[PDB]
């Protein structure tokens, strides 16, 4: 966690339901967006920190 890894996502298309339908996740707290609503949207860039 002191040196977290970031993946850039760009020039691409997604389906966030493949994530939000999964029971595998113990938490899925979205801020400034609804998870169900993500499939209506587009973004300049997305960053996936881990």
């Amino acid at each position: 966690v002191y040196a977290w890894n970031r993946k850039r996502i760009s020039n691409c298309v997604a389906d966030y339901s493949v994530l939000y339908n999964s029971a595998s996740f113990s938490t899925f707290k979205c801020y400034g967006v609804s998870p169900t609503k993500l499939n209506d949207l587009c973004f300049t860039n997305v960053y996936a920190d881990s």
Binding site: I9, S10, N11, C12, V13, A14, D15, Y16, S26, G32, V33, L38, N39, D40, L41, C42, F43, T44, N45, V46, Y47, A48, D49, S50
Partner: protein, 49 residues
């Protein structure tokens, strides 16, 4: 593995989204449709609804 459920390790991922006053490069799965002109229409251009 003897640690309690709060003391155990968790994997964490943070999806960060940005939509500037600049064109999109990532989108959801929704399929496009034909353009219509001079009629009154509801629209969604890249999340500009």
């Amino acid at each position: 593995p003897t640690y309690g459920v709060g003391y155990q390790p968790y994997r964490v991922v943070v999806l960060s989204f940005e939509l500037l006053h600049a064109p999109a490069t990532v989108c959801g799965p929704k399929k496009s449709t034909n353009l219509v002109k001079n009629k009154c229409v509801n629209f969604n251009f890249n999340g500009l609804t």
